[PDB]
Amino acid sequence: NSAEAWYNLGNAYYKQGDYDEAIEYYQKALELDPNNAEAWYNLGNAYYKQGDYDEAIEYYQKALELDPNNAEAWYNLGNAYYKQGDYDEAIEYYQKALELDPNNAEAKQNLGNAKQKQG
Ligand SMILES: [Pb+2]
Ligand SMILES: [Pb+2]
Structure with a gap:
């Protein structure tokens, strides 16, 4: 309303x-x-x-609690952690994004890059 x-x-x-x-x-x-x-x-x-x-992460987390099928939200949460240098978290959330949307090229790329960053 x-x-x-x-x-x-x-x-x-x-x-x-x-x-x-x-x-x-x-x-x-x-x-x-x-x-x-x-x-x-x-x-x-x-x-x-x-x-x-950090705000982005908070609100993405809330969206995903309500709608855990939002592939783009998992990907953007991964990006947000990547921006903070939290590559373990980024990797997890990228993996989740790709499970729902295996065709997200940017998720694959950032996932790869994140794996390099930690090593
Ligand atoms: Pb906050
Ligand atoms: Pb986590």
Whole structure:
């Protein structure tokens, strides 16, 4: 209801690259409906695009608790850990992404690179 309205507005602002606004609007939506997995996921993405990887991780984790079939979310969580230098975590989440979407070339590549980084 208003939760959907806020989510819709977050999405519009997200797509235009206004992350600060999108983050505000997603947070409003989730105050009203905390079960919207796509709102958690997109909030995560918006923080990720801001370079705020610890927030991204928090919100990706919440999205995946609600929707553990979101292959892209597993991949982006892996990216977020990779950005923090947490290559063990990145590797795990990339492996999970590829189980659901074996065709994610970038997941395979980052997984490979992450394995090099640890050694
Ligand atoms: Pb936090
Ligand atoms: Pb873990």
